[PDB]
RNA sequence: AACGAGCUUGGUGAUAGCUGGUUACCCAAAAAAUGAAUUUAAGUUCAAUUUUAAACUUGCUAAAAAAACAAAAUCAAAAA
RNA sequence: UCGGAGAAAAUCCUCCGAAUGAUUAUAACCUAGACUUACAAGUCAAAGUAAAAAUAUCUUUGACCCAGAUA
């Protein structure tokens, strides 16, 4: 095989192995909070955008640590099905790849936000202000 | 143009499927294009007149017109307007019906 | 075909029986009769009737519309922009299914051009083909393909099925030879070297995430795994694959064809390839 | 017989093979003809073109 | 303009058109507003915003610009990262 | 042999928003001479009209009350 | 050339002004739908976002090319 001064062997002498690029990274399925694809069940409903749904049983799932599981269930109760599985869907693209990618990122974000305590309450939005004020009126109305 | 390779399972992931064997026994035969596709083409003239063309028809082109009218009549709710060019062997229909006619002609096995 | 039976009954076809297709010819009108004669369609006497009306775009003396609009650089540098023919995965699957592209061997611009899957115009500023994500959902082929540009979604589809994609740069002289190798061979010149990308494109082709042909191989495994996690598929170990040797094949940055080194002469007439022996030439080509 | 493949839906066309050796040698063989050459649509306007 | 040039026998483009207007492949032409860079200190804010916009051309103006340019300027250009990629086509246009 | 600037050839088929002319039959449709800009008003470009082809659906006449006016047109439910 | 007023949608019809300044709470970006309009030019504006914690208040004009001034 012809080789030149710009051949990849000469440009990058250290990685002269034939399979350096084609190997699979050692480990790395544990660090970076890897999501086990096999556990998740993926169904593609073509609603035009191809909707994608990722659902798993939050409590039974063991890859997520138990302390995170409890916080996620309380925080995102609205997304848990009657069977107890956590149902999240994406319908923002015509390619199910991105719809699945959007769904997966939600899992990663949900785990991360539960892991890190949200100490900051931030400013109170008008929606929160209306909710708070009406709650106070209910308390005062129930002076009995 | 190379002959398409034999595939274990049809339809092929792109969607292409070869003509069925045994041959259809209809009065009319619709031949495939040199690229091995069904010869149905969307057309437009004047910038507003939408038409669909079935082109490589051999045999009784009038029998095909009869079947096309019956097949498309329920969808329209009225009989489609069509032109038969017996010299060129093509059938022209007013409106875009390429996808329905492409699926329709696959079932017949052309 | 009953129509052919009609010919049997009819008189002989000859030069005296010929007729054009109906309505294929319009009538040419000459200004001789009263209808189209007389003023001959030009109207009453005036500048227009005498044939001397002002040029197109003249508005009778006021500043014309095409001159009152400010100049703005819409088309500045247009002839120097690079254009990439878009090849979608939908079209790629269609070509593979019908046998026009052979998935067993590596796919380069020559194979796409030979199978008529893509049409390249180097004279019209084409620099090659870009992979386009369209059709990614239904792409189910294992392929080794070399393209000039690629998108993240398109690369994901190729890798998920077990194939390999790399982005490689070809210069205008190299692109013409790659698209049409045989006409080049008939010229009788030796194969030229492939020029490296312009400084603008060096970052693109030296980046692992784009699978650049000048990028570090050591950084490929990390980039390949990252797409797998992002797009929810399991990276396939292609080394175990039987066709790993074909899939791993990549051209040298200065090579236009897979098995032909720069500086060789292809003698198609005698089915031979001639290689130079002069040392100075070999240094030139080997560089 | 035709050396190329005839389409299955079309049957071959045929003609009498003849010889010029003798006056009466009007039939010595039987020859297949490709239907797509000798049985095309009777397109007399294309002949005009 | 020149309909039949002496050297090549072809139509010639009016380069003043090419220097002011952009053609989208669908058939539309884009332009700037006259005076958008002139005497901005005395123009109202809403007026300045109207001037800054890119605006389409009428059917007659489009017909004239088509006559004043040759076919080379009407072709498909596949520019990588083109910012007008989406505007070369018409969608849901019934007419 | 008609000089405010000779004559001949050539440039040269100079140019002329000006005058004159522009060669068979039949069928059909048809403006208007309005508004705008122009060293523009003896011309031209655009609108408006007219027209050919095509697409698909309401148009024309009329039009109550009811507003807008001040104390026959604009608008246009139902119908015919 | 343009604006205001009468005739009242005509006029070589009759008047006043403008090629403005003053005033300042300094008056963003972005964006549905409309007016006006041969073209060009000229008007009004919900929603969203952003500064602040009421808009500027009085009531107009010059295109393209081409030259400037700067960061
Ligand atoms: Mg003529
Ligand atoms: Mg091209
Ligand atoms: Mg004399
Ligand atoms: Mg003349
Ligand atoms: Mg004149
Ligand atoms: Mg002037
Ligand atoms: Mg009515
Ligand atoms: Mg306008
Ligand atoms: Mg608002």
From Swiss-Prot, chain A:
Component of the mitochondrial ribosome large subunit (39S) which comprises a 16S rRNA and about 50 distinct proteins. The keyword Membrane does not apply. The gene is Mrpl58. One of its GO terms (cellular component) is mitochondrial large ribosomal subunit. Its main location: mitochondrion. Its EC number is 3.1.1.29. Transmembrane segments: none annotated. This is Large ribosomal subunit protein mL62. It comes from the Eukaryota. It catalyses: an N-acyl-L-alpha-aminoacyl-tRNA + H2O = an N-acyl-L-amino acid + a tRNA + H(+). The chain holds residues 38 to 191 of 206 of the full protein. Belongs to the prokaryotic/mitochondrial release factor family. Mitochondrion-specific ribosomal protein mL62 subfamily. It is found in: Mitochondrion. Keywords: Hydrolase, Methylation, Mitochondrion, Protein biosynthesis, Ribonucleoprotein, Ribosomal protein, Transit peptide. Essential peptidyl-tRNA hydrolase component of the mitochondrial large ribosomal subunit. Acts as a codon-independent translation release factor that has lost all stop codon specificity and directs the termination of translation in mitochondrion, possibly in case of abortive elongation. May be involved in the hydrolysis of peptidyl-tRNAs that have been prematurely terminated and thus in the recycling of stalled mitochondrial ribosomes. One of its GO terms (biological process) is mitochondrial translational termination. Methylation of glutamine in the GGQ triplet by HEMK1. It is an enzyme of class 3 (hydrolase). GO terms for molecular function: peptidyl-tRNA hydrolase activity; translation release factor activity, codon nonspecific.
From Swiss-Prot, chain C:
SUPFAM superfamilies: Ribosomal proteins L15p and L18e (SSF52080). Keywords: Mitochondrion, Ribonucleoprotein, Ribosomal protein, Transit peptide. It is found in: Mitochondrion. GO terms for biological process: cellular response to leukemia inhibitory factor; mitochondrial genome maintenance; mitochondrial translation; translation. Transmembrane segments: none annotated. It holds the Pfam family Ribosomal_L27A. Residues 1-12 form a transit peptide. Residues 13-59 are annotated as: Disordered. One of its GO terms (molecular function) is structural constituent of ribosome. The keyword Transmembrane helix does not apply. Residues 24-43 have a biased composition (Basic residues). Component of the mitochondrial ribosome large subunit (39S) which comprises a 16S rRNA and about 50 distinct proteins. Belongs to the universal ribosomal protein uL15 family. HAMAP family: Ribosomal_uL15. This is Large ribosomal subunit protein uL15m. It comes from Mus musculus.
Swiss-Prot record, chain D:
It comes from the Eukaryota. It is found in: Mitochondrion. Belongs to the universal ribosomal protein uL4 family. Component of the mitochondrial ribosome large subunit (39S) which comprises a 16S rRNA and about 50 distinct proteins. Interacts with MIEF1 upstream open reading frame protein. This is Large ribosomal subunit protein uL4m.
Curated annotation (Swiss-Prot), chain E:
It is found in: Mitochondrion. The chain holds residues 94 to 188 of 188 of the full protein. GO terms for biological process: mitochondrial translation. Its main location: mitochondrion. Belongs to the bacterial ribosomal protein bL35 family. Coiled coil: none annotated. One of its GO terms (cellular component) is mitochondrial large ribosomal subunit. This is Large ribosomal subunit protein bL35m. It comes from Mus musculus. It comes from the Eukaryota. Keywords: Mitochondrion, Ribonucleoprotein, Ribosomal protein, Transit peptide. One of its GO terms (molecular function) is structural constituent of ribosome.
């Amino acid at each position: 095989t012809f080789q030149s001064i710009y051949s990849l062997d000469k440009l990058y002498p250290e990685s002269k192995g034939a399979d350096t690029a084609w190997k699979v990274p050692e480990h790395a399925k544990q660090a970076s909070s890897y999501i086990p694809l096999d556990r998740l069940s993926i169904s593609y409903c073509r609603s035009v955008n191809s909707k994608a749904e990722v659902r798993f049983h939050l409590a039974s799932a063991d890859w997520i640590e138990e302390p995170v599981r409890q916080k996620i269930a309380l925080t995102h109760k609205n997304k848990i099905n009657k069977a107890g599985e956590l149902v999240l869907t994406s319908e923002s693209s015509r390619y199910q790849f991105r719809n699945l990618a959007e769904c997966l990122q939600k899992i990663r974000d949900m785990i991360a936000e539960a892991s890190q305590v949200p100490k900051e309450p931030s400013k109170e939005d008008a929606r929160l202000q209306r909710l708070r004020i009406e709650k106070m009126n209910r308390e005062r109305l129930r002076q009995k | 143009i190379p002959e398409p390779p034999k595939h274990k399972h049809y339809p092929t992931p792109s969607g292409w499927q070869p003509p069925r064997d045994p041959l259809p026994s209809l009065p009319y035969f619709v031949r495939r294009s040199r690229m091995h596709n069904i010869p149905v083409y969307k057309e437009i003239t004047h910038g507003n007149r939408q038409m669909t063309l079935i082109r490589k028809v051999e045999g009784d082109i009038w029998a095909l017109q009869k079947d096309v009218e019956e097949f498309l009549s329920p969808l329209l709710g009225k009989t489609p307007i069509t032109q038969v060019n017996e010299v060129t062997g093509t059938l022209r229909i007013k409106g875009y019906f390429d996808e329905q006619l492409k699926a329709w002609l696959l079932e017949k096995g052309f | 075909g009953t129509s052919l039976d009609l010919l049997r009954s009819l008189p002989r076809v000859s030069l005296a029986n010929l007729k054009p297709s109906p309505n294929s010819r319009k009538r040419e009108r000459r200004p001789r009769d009263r209808r189209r004669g007389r003023k001959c369609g030009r109207g009453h006497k005036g500048e227009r009737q005498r044939g001397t009306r002002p040029r197109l775009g003249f508005e009778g003396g006021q500043t014309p519309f095409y001159i009152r609009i400010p100049k703005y650089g819409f088309n500045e540098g247009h002839s120097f922009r690079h254009q990439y023919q878009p090849l979608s995965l939908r079209r790629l699957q269609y070509l593979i299914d019908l046998g026009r592209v052979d998935p067993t061997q590596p796919i380069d611009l020559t194979q796409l051009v030979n199978g008529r899957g893509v049409t390249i115009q180097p004279l019209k500023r084409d620099y090659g083909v870009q992979l386009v994500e369209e059709g990614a959902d239904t792409f189910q082929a294992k392929i080794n393909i070399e393209v000039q540009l690629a998108s993240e979604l398109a690369i994901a589809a190729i890798e998920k099925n077990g194939g390999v994609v790399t982005t490689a740069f070809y210069d205008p002289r190299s692109l013409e030879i790659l698209c049409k190798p045989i006409p080049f061979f008939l010229r009788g010149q030796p194969i030229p070297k492939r020029m490296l990308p312009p400084e603008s494109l060096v970052p693109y082709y030296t980046d692992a995430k784009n699978r650049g042909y000048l990028a570090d191989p050591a950084k490929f495994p990390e980039a390949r795994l990252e797409l797998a996690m992002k797009f929810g598929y399991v990276l396939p170990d292609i080394t175990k694959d039987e066709l790993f040797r074909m899939l791993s094949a990549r051209k040298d940055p200065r090579q236009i064809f897979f098995g032909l080194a720069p500086g060789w002469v292809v003698n198609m007439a005698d089915k031979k390839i001639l290689k130079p022996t002069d040392e100075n030439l070999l240094k030139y080509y080997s560089s | 017989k035709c050396e190329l493949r005839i389409p299955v839906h079309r049957r071959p066309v045929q003609a009498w093979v003849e010889s010029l050796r003798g006056f009466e040698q009007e039939r010595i063989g039987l020859a297949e003809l490709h239907p797509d050459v000798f049985a095309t649509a009777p397109r007399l306007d294309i002949v005009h073109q | 303009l020149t309909y039949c040039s002496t050297r090549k026998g072809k139509r010639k483009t009016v380069k003043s058109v090419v220097h002011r207007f952009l053609r989208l492949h669908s058939g539309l032409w884009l332009r700037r507003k006259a005076g958008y860079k002139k005497k901005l200190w005395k123009k109202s804010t809403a007026r300045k915003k109207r001037l800054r916009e890119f605006v389409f051309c009428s059917k007659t103006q489009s017909k004239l610009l088509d006559k004043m340019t040759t076919s080379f300027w009407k072709r498909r250009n596949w520019y990588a990262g083109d910012p007008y990629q989406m505007y070369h086509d018409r969608t849901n246009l019934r007419v």
